[PDB]
């Protein structure tokens, strides 16, 4: 069948979005507020060097191997009144993981070798600023298998379980340290997932590990 251009925007003011809306309207490009499997283009606010902030749409964009391109793609296409090529405007990095890590490009090219493949991940709440099912969708897009309960982890030397938590979300008790007594798997911060996705390369769990009381 025909999968058609379909955009979402991120990090744009309500104003800048209007320009995109006009752009989408002129060229009859589908524009939506919510990102989906169908979405092909994620238009990010960036600087002159195509570096951008890390938003939910940014992560999901890369994870889905979609076109993650700069807002300049839209404005420049307007200034030339033509549909410019995405390749020229693909974001090269973000503020956090490097300004040219080429995460988006690698994500487009590694859809047969997903980073989280062969892993089972449980997103152990609570979290903030990012719905748990969105985080779960993010890993799922990256080949990881999602697990709801710590007791739902699949056993076997061939399956690797990972528990992901956000320490800042917990309150005044090192509860997150007590998880290890519930099941044996590595407990890592949400940053591990976010860094891995942004670069679209599976980071070593070392720097993200959380001390589990015996």
């Amino acid at each position: 069948v025909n999968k058609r251009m379909s955009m979402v925007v991120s990090g744009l003011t309500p104003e800048e979005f209007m320009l995109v809306y006009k752009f989408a309207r002129k060229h009859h490009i589908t524009l939506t507020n919510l990102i989906t499997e169908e979405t092909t283009h994620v238009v990010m606010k960036t600087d002159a060097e195509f570096v951008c902030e890390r938003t939910l749409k940014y992560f999901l964009g890369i994870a889905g191997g979609k076109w993650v391109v700069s807002y300049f793609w839209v404005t420049q296409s307007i200034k030339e009144r033509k549909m410019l090529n995405e390749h020229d405007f693909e974001v090269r990095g973000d503020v956090v993981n490097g300004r040219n890590h080429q995460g988006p490009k690698r994500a487009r090219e590694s859809q047969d070798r997903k980073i989280f493949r062969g892993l089972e991940i449980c997103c152990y709440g609570p979290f903030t600023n990012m719905p748990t099912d969105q985080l779960e969708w993010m890993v799922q897009l990256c080949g990881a298998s999602v697990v709801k309960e710590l007791s739902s982890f699949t056993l076997g030397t061939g399956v690797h379980p990972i528990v992901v938590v956000q320490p800042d979300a917990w309150t005044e008790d090192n509860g997150f340290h007590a998880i290890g007594q519930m099941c044996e798997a590595p407990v890592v911060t949400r940053e591990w997932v976010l860094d891995s996705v942004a670069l679209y390369q599976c980071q070593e769990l070392d720097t993200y590990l959380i001390p589990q009381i015996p």
């Binding site: 990090g11 003011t13 309500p14 992560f59 990012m130």
Partner: peptide
């Protein structure tokens, strides 16, 4: 607005 959070 209620602009999207950043990580």
């Amino acid at each position: 607005y209620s602009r999207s959070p950043t990580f």
